[PDB]
Amino acid sequence: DADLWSSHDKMLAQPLKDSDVEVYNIIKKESNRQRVGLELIASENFASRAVLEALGSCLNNKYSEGYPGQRYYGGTEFIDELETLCQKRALQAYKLDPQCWGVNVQPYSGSPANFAVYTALVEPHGRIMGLDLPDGGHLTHGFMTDKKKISATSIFFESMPYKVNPDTGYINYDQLEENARLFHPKLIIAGTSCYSRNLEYARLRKIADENGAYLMADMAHISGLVAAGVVPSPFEHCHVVTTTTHKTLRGCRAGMIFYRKGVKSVDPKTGKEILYNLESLINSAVFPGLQGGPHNHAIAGVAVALKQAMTLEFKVYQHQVVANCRALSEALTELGYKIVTGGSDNHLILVDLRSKGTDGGRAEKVLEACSIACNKNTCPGDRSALRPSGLRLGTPALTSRGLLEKDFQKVAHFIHRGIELTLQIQSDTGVRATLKEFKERLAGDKYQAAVQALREEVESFASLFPLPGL
């Protein structure tokens, strides 16, 4: 008889290297690329090998729609031990009284986390106020132009941004407090994806209370810092805290929603009092509202990343983050670079390349060709969103490998040497000023020797450190 049926059995147990060498090559190619690169993209990091194991496990198989104690099909006994162990670890990592804070750990990624909160607390066409995109706010905090609403947050809800003060570089809280009285937010977003300094959660809570609006923090970018205490915690001031489980938390791609439960209103003559109904609203928006079967294999990685974040090693790792950040920010500042806002209270800095006579658009694509990766970003006071003059560098990714202040100064010198190239390639184009032309001149032969020269040096340096996972 024709028995490829015992072969089909083999295919399900065949290892990756054998089943599909094509993606096995793509993976081991990327693994190499990561190890020979100085990763300065602020939102990057290298996930623990304990997280990567839990990620791909038989946990991938169980559908477990619902929540513990409200599952829908029989089999959710060990997936229940997990989801409650995970959200239990979360509430510990940030030292929250479980009777004052609940958490939902099902959101698929960060953006899906934020959107679920709006669905649960704002309702369609409710007004939302977040930091403007070019001033350092994430897409899901609202983004829309004269012509079209671009971010889903702006499509299904009515958003209006509040901006940073271009003279100082800090959030303009006075103008927010003022415009809020004209816009009437229902929920204010206290979060950023490219802000050097701390948020005045204390003052944002006052603005939200005066307008009758929820205050939700999007600590995705500083979740790791907040957890180690290296940055003041948004929990004592916010009604809801959304977070990405990666970036500075070194977990797998996922997201969580912290929501205060307990008592909300006083009523000093009514006797009885109001209570936070955030638990039911948020959980009902995640499911049956927006998602389906939770990614139990992702909750596993989040659970182990949360334990890893409550360690002592993790505490000092985050302190090195902020230290390596200022160590870098200082080195560039000494070299004559304008660091937006003057410095940083967290893991990233926005350097305004107009102090050296270039823009982040051209500088980004030349550093990349040298195996040091980052991203452009508009600066407070930028004259056009098309020629952004800023680069956003962050430590967490590199410092996760072992880099120290001493080392990050070498990283700042390599960076500068990259800008030295950008200025040269820009002087050649000069009069003929077009990104397509600049993009080509670099790929041209004249500089293909100079870029290779700096590229050899940066990779020889990056190779000296470890790379968690492989």
Q: Restricting to residues 53-112, which ones interact with ligand PLP according to CB under 6 A?
A: 109-111
Q: Which residue is nearest to ligand PLP (CB)?
A: 110
Q: Please tell me whether residue 29 binds a second copy under the rule CB under 8 A.
A: yes
Q: Please tell me whether residue 43 binds a second copy under the rule CB under 8 A.
A: yes
Q: Which of residues 372-401 bind ligand PLP (CB under 6 A)?
A: none
Q: How far is the CB of 354 from ligand PLP (least distance, A)?
A: 25
User: Six-digit token pair at 219?
Assistant: 């600590």
Q: How far is the CB of 295 from ligand PLP (least distance, A)?
A: 8
For residue 240, the cross-strand partners are 216, 259
Q: Exactly one of 43, 45, 119, 409 binds ligand PLP (CB under 6 A); which one? A: 43
For residue 408, CA distances in Å to 79, 281, 396, 418 come to 42, 45, 11, 15
Q: How far is the CB of 239 from a second copy (least distance, A)?
A: 16
Closer of 11 and 263 to a second copy (Cβ): 11
User: Six-digit token pair at 402?
Assistant: 């072992």
Q: Please tell me whether residue 58 binds a second copy under the rule CB under 8 A.
A: yes
Q: Please tell me whether residue 218 binds ligand PLP under the rule CB under 6 A.
A: yes
Output phi, psi for 453, to 5 deg. Answer: -65, -50
> Could you say which of 221, 237, 239, 246 is catalytic?
246
User: Six-digit token pair at 373?
Assistant: 């990766």
> Could you say which of 86, 141, 194, 238 is catalytic?
194
Helices and strands, counts by H and E, the chain: 18, 17
SS3 content of the chain, % helix, strand, coil (to 5): 50, 15, 35
- Name the binder of 341 from a second copy, ligand PLP, none, CB < 5-8 A by kind: none
Q: Exactly one of 233, 283, 308, 324 binds a second copy (CB under 8 A); which one? A: 308
Closer of 248 and 371 to ligand PLP (Cβ): 248
DSSP annotation of 162: B
Site string for ligand PLP, 237-256 (x = CB under 6 A): -------x------------
- Name the binder of 191 from ligand PLP, a second copy, none, CB < 5-8 A by kind: ligand PLP
Q: Please tell me whether residue 23 binds a second copy under the rule CB under 8 A.
A: yes
Q: Please tell me whether residue 134 binds ligand PLP under the rule CB under 6 A.
A: no
Q: What dihedral do alpha carbons 92, 93, 97, 102 form, nearest 10°? A: -90
CB 37 within 8 A of CB 463: no
CA atoms within 13 A on the CB side of 228: 23
Q: Exactly one of 38, 48, 324, 451 binds a second copy (CB under 8 A); which one? A: 48
User: Six-digit token pair at 243?
Assistant: 């977070």
Dihedral class, residue 68 (left if φ above 0, else alpha if ψ from -120 to 50, else beta): beta
Closer of 252 and 454 to ligand PLP (Cβ): 252
Q: Is 100 a catalytic residue?
A: no
Q: Is 237 a catalytic residue?
A: no
214 vs 219: CA distance, rounded Å: 16
CB 119 within 8 A of CB 289: yes
CA 275 to chain centre: 32
Residues with catalytic function:
194, 246
